[PDB]
Design a protein around this ligand. Structure first.
Ligand SMILES: [K+]
Ligand SMILES: [K+]
Ligand SMILES: [K+]
Ligand SMILES: [K+]
Ligand SMILES: [K+]
Ligand SMILES: [Mg+2]
Ligand SMILES: [Mg+2]
Ligand SMILES: [Mg+2]
Ligand SMILES: [Mg+2]
Ligand SMILES: [Mg+2]
Ligand SMILES: [Mg+2]
Ligand SMILES: [Mg+2]
Ligand SMILES: [Mg+2]
Ligand SMILES: [Mg+2]
Ligand SMILES: [Mg+2]
Ligand SMILES: [Mg+2]
Ligand SMILES: [Mg+2]
Ligand SMILES: [Mg+2]
Ligand SMILES: [Mg+2]
Ligand SMILES: [Mg+2]
Ligand SMILES: [Mg+2]
Ligand SMILES: [Mg+2]
Ligand SMILES: [Mg+2]
Ligand SMILES: [Mg+2]
Ligand SMILES: [Mg+2]
Ligand SMILES: [Mg+2]
Ligand SMILES: [Mg+2]
Ligand SMILES: [Mg+2]
Ligand SMILES: [Mg+2]
Ligand SMILES: [Mg+2]
Ligand SMILES: [Mg+2]
Ligand SMILES: [Mg+2]
Ligand SMILES: [Mg+2]
Ligand SMILES: [Mg+2]
Ligand SMILES: [Mg+2]
Ligand SMILES: [Mg+2]
Ligand SMILES: [Mg+2]
Ligand SMILES: [Mg+2]
Ligand SMILES: [Mg+2]
Ligand SMILES: [Mg+2]
Ligand SMILES: [Mg+2]
Ligand SMILES: [Mg+2]
Ligand SMILES: [Mg+2]
Ligand SMILES: [Mg+2]
Ligand SMILES: [Mg+2]
Ligand SMILES: [Mg+2]
Ligand SMILES: [Mg+2]
Ligand SMILES: [Mg+2]
Lengths: 96, 168
RNA sequence: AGACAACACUGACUAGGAUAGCUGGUUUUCUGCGAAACCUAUAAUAGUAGGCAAUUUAAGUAACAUCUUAGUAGGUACAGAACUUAAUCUCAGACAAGAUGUAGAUUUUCAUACCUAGGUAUGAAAUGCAUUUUUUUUUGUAUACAUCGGGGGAUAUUUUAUCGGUGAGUAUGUAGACUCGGAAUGACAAAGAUGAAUCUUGAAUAAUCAGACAUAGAAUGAUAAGGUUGUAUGUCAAAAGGGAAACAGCCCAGAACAAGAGUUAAGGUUCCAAAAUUAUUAUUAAGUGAAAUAAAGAAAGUUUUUAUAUAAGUCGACAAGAAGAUGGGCUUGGAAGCAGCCAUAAUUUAAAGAUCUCGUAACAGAGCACUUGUUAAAUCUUAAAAGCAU
RNA sequence: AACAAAGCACUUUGCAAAAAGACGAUAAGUCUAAGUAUUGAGUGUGAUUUCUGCCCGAUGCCGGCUGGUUAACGAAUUUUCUAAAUUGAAAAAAAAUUUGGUUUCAGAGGAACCCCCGGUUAAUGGCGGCCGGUCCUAAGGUAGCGAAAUGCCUUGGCCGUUAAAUGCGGUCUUGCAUGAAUGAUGUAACGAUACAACAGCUGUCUCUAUGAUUGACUCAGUGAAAUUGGAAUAACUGUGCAGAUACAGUUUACCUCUAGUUAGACGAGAAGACCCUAUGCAGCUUUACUGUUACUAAUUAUUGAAUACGAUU
RNA sequence: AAAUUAGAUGUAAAAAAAAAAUCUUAUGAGGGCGGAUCCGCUUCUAAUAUUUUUUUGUAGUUAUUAUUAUAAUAAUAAUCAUGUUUAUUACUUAAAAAGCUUAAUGGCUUAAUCUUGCCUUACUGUUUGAUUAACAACAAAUCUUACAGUCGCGUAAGCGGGGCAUAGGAUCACAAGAUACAAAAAGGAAAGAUCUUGGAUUUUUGGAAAAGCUACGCUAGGGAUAACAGGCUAAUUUGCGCAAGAGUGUACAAAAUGAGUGCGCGGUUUGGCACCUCGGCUUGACUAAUCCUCAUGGAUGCAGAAACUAUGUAGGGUACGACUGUUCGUCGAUUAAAAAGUUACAUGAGCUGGGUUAAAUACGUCGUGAGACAGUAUGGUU
């Protein structure tokens, strides 16, 4: 009820102040006096050995989170007549 | 308010509670601080009423009337005791207000006194007050060491010595 | 009269057609495993369903349990008085400089009217005591400029060791809805190791849903109940056996069947009754006690310890003394140490309270505190505390 | 002391085809009654003396408007689908109208009950507070009675009765919570009703004794019953599903019968008695729920005409 | 006393440089050694932080003073300021409180408050992962993710599927829209299906349209919940003791007396719990906290007598009558005295049945009524 803990590294806060994980990692409870000297945060790190808060001068630690698959090249072959020999669409234009 | 009639609401009912039982070496309230002599409860922790403390005060005044003295009180009746009827059955809510009371730990001071009187005249006044109070009481002088539980810190005895596992 | 209508009548008898979430009963052996008396829902609360979950035996296991190491969540015991609550205690005011009036010593400096660069004076200052100083008609520094009403008394008026209120305090206490500090325990997950498969899933498929007591800690009651109701742990329930005289719940220990002066647990060892009349040091004299602690309290019971007195005669007894101003002043019919009130610096003595206990209407009188002497103890006085007893 | 009762009172019944009332799966019909308002039925009260007060607001019943409401009926309204036709659209097309069938909506007028007005207390029922004054009600308990069969306080006060009166009688009353045909009140007579007192009388008692018969007891003959887990079935204290012949400890006791007695065997018998539980029953009550009737009202049909008036407008 | 307005912390704002060490980090050197990127060891470099660290510098400008010959040097003071001083900017200013839809708790002040601009995402469909597998089941729920569609705000990054968080019930039936699914011979339709939406003290709120009496009562059960007794307990008691001693006692605490109290015993009264579903007569037994009889201490208040108090002591006795159903209580008259208690408040397979007391009946009160009453009255298989 309210923000006793605040969302830190790789976490999102819900409408009811519920803190979730935004990535696959390991939960961490810590404090960050650089960001706020009176708050305590919850984080999620990709490596169980990482220590939060990260130094402000170090590169962000982020994971790709994607899988490689062959691209799908579309074919322009949509017929105009259906299997029943009927037009799949009829176009009409008005005249003034 | 007063030490027998606090500025509290009689409607808000209080749980029975328990007197403090210092098990970590606390000497809180076991020494004479204001007066020269004191009355110490030396047997067990209890809950004294406001009518018992009022009678004890009257007994010290009846014995010291016509003399110069300053009586201090180190306890305050801030505990509401709610008594349901003895003729009632169990349940049906908590009882109604009966009287005020105070919780006293063991070896704590109740009354202190300072005046231009003789020691023996004060011993008798505290003896009578102790006779009418619940439990067993003792005469204490200013300067006596504090008490940790039921053990007095006499002859250079400290709290760390009582905490030391090795005592033989 | 709910009276009678052929054993029956607040609605007969007989034949045909019921239910009962309630009570009782449910019949051979062996073997393996083995609960629950809790949650949720219910026209429920004696019932029932779904879970937790007992069982069967296959498929899995990076299963489950425990410990170690590192890590994390959370505020109990405790402790404390910070914030909050009750009550209580203390303080509410200081210095420096300046200013003010004074008593001095009459040396020095300075300003002055002079005399002739000195001096008679004449003023101030210096030196020593006071006084003024928390908002003043006294500035500064350091501090929370640091305090108001009412009611008595004093003289519109002032003053308080009186009440309430404000400010200050690293003052005292108080705690289910105070926690600045803060355990152990328990909880979560990771790795490793260990272990009695204890775990999960598939398929199949139950019972149970007033629990009881012990221990700790609470609410409730009356700090009563073999009371009621949560939490933690165990036992009983469904567990025999040994101990607790007898014993569901306590202390041990989990019965497949025998043998053994076998090895042990709790518990015991003079006899009943298996095993010590086994060793050491003390206490008790009361059968206290010895397997269910009655209290406060009293007291030349006894022991120990710690102080203390003693041939400078302790302790006890005995002998004598225990004055004088003075019948203190007042009060009172009377108050002479001794109804009551006020005072209770002295004086002289080996010592002697303007008086501790009796006594007189008031005096008188007998004791005490106190003083000397005699008798007399060579581990032998007095007191307190503690232990065990009465 | 309840019921009935003579007496008293109220309501109802005109008899012309059925008097009312009762009975009739429901009628014809029967009793009423071969009766007729001084008859029959229903209701309450309960001879007689002395009396029976106030309130018609509520409830019930009765009567009453050229009234309101008013189901059925019904002037005036309205809709779904489909068939055909017409119009329309005539582009991939609906849509609208009329008619047939089919299926809905709809209410000016129009009964009783009800609304409204009045009557009725020997109808069901009601019959006051505050401090002479005052507020309120339909009306405020009148007459009489009154510690009563009514009274919690209470053994009310006083008088009589008793050596001693929570009783009985008389009397006063501010009567928790008397009261006038759910009748009020007082006598005569009557009562196996209830209460109280006096005299007499007595084994009721002080306080029992003796005597008689039948049983009880013994012998002979005949020969049950409830009951019964099995029993070698003592006392005390303790223990324990909490009151022990049976467990612990200690004590005590030779074996076995007869007649007495009933302290215990939580003695026996009766699911006897009470309380609670069941989404178990029964009867009864009512302004419980849901229903059926008696009865009332309107109307198609059996069922055809005339006249006038009144009200809608 | 209470109306409005204005106030209520402090600091900083020319500018640094250099050496070592302690870690911690690095998608730095594609470092090196093993098993460019992963893991374990690791040297160097760089960055943040830390040291009270070894320090160096602390000017310039304006002016003042001193020295030197308007300038130089030193010292002192001031110094955010090229900017409409109402300056501005950054940091700091305990806790509580205010505000944030409504109580309370937590939270927000760096926004979740306030102000303003433009807006309606308080969107449509489907869907992820959780609430240590929501409520110790299921269901209704809560939080959250992604994709597609198309709207808003914003320079942009991005935010938006109502509100700072935690308090509003289904199905069925009914009603309004959409979908084009099926259409009982066939073409239509009716009645159905799917999606969206609406109306509920369905408040016994997982959701029945629902008043009583029985003492004339009945059946199945419970003692899983009562009344008597027993058991546990001891608040209370018309049961007692001890301690202390205000006070009374002409004097004088303790002859007698004993405020409000404290520490206990006991199991008589009224109660709690829920282990467990009357009185009289006759005849006893037992206790001792004693009314009489026996021995005895104390008693300005024991002359004697009588009585008071207290210590021993339970052998025997404690009667008769009136009233009341009574135990109890009141009263009369005697007596040495006319005391208590336990025992299933001893004793109904020993007796009694007056009280309580089922069916009958009346009165008062209560109830619309049937009926009821800790009421009253007469009667009622022991
Ligand atoms: K009337
Ligand atoms: K009427
Ligand atoms: K009328
Ligand atoms: K109509
Ligand atoms: K009258
Ligand atoms: Mg005491
Ligand atoms: Mg009857
Ligand atoms: Mg009958
Ligand atoms: Mg097993
Ligand atoms: Mg269990
Ligand atoms: Mg239901
Ligand atoms: Mg049931
Ligand atoms: Mg903390
Ligand atoms: Mg229990
Ligand atoms: Mg069982
Ligand atoms: Mg066992
Ligand atoms: Mg033994
Ligand atoms: Mg052996
Ligand atoms: Mg032996
Ligand atoms: Mg003994
Ligand atoms: Mg004098
Ligand atoms: Mg005198
Ligand atoms: Mg008559
Ligand atoms: Mg007829
Ligand atoms: Mg009659
Ligand atoms: Mg009559
Ligand atoms: Mg019609
Ligand atoms: Mg009409
Ligand atoms: Mg009348
Ligand atoms: Mg009448
Ligand atoms: Mg024979
Ligand atoms: Mg027994
Ligand atoms: Mg045996
Ligand atoms: Mg018998
Ligand atoms: Mg007999
Ligand atoms: Mg908002
Ligand atoms: Mg806006
Ligand atoms: Mg769950
Ligand atoms: Mg068809
Ligand atoms: Mg429910
Ligand atoms: Mg629910
Ligand atoms: Mg009756
Ligand atoms: Mg029971
Ligand atoms: Mg004597
Ligand atoms: Mg003898
Ligand atoms: Mg009895
Ligand atoms: Mg009997
Ligand atoms: Mg009779």
């Amino acid at each position: 009820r309210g923000t006793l803990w605040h969302p830190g590294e790789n976490t999102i806060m819900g409408r009811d102040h519920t803190i979730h994980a935004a990535v696959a990692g390991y939960v961490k409870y810590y404090r960050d006096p650089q960001l706020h000297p009176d708050r305590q945060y919850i984080g999620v790190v990709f490596n169980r050995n990482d220590k939060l808060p990260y130094p402000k001068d170090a590169p962000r630690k982020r994971k790709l989170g994607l899988v490689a698959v062959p691209r799908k090249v579309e074919e322009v072959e949509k017929p105009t007549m259906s299997a029943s020999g009927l037009p799949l669409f009829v176009t009409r234009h008005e005249t003034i | 308010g007063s030490w027998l009639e606090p500025n509290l609401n009689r409607k808000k009912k209080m749980m029975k509670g328990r007197p403090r039982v210092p098990t970590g070496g606390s000497t809180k309230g076991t020494t004479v601080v204001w007066g020269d002599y004191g009355l110490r409860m030396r047997d067990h922790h209890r809950r004294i009423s406001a009518q018992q403390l009022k009678l004890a005060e009257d007994t010290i005044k009846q014995r010291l009337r016509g003399q110069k003295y300053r009586l201090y009180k180190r306890v305050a009746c801030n505990v509401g005791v709610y008594v349901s009827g003895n003729e009632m059955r169990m349940g049906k809510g908590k009882g109604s207000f009966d009287h005020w009371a105070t919780r006293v730990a063991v070896n704590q001071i109740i009354f202190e006194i300072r005046g231009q009187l003789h020691e023996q005249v004060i011993r008798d006044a505290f003896r009578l007050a102790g006779h009418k109070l619940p439990g067993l009481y003792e005469f204490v002088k200013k300067g006596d060491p504090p008490v940790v539980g039921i053990t007095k810190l006499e002859d250079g005895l400290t709290v760390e010595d009582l905490k030391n596992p090795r005592k033989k």
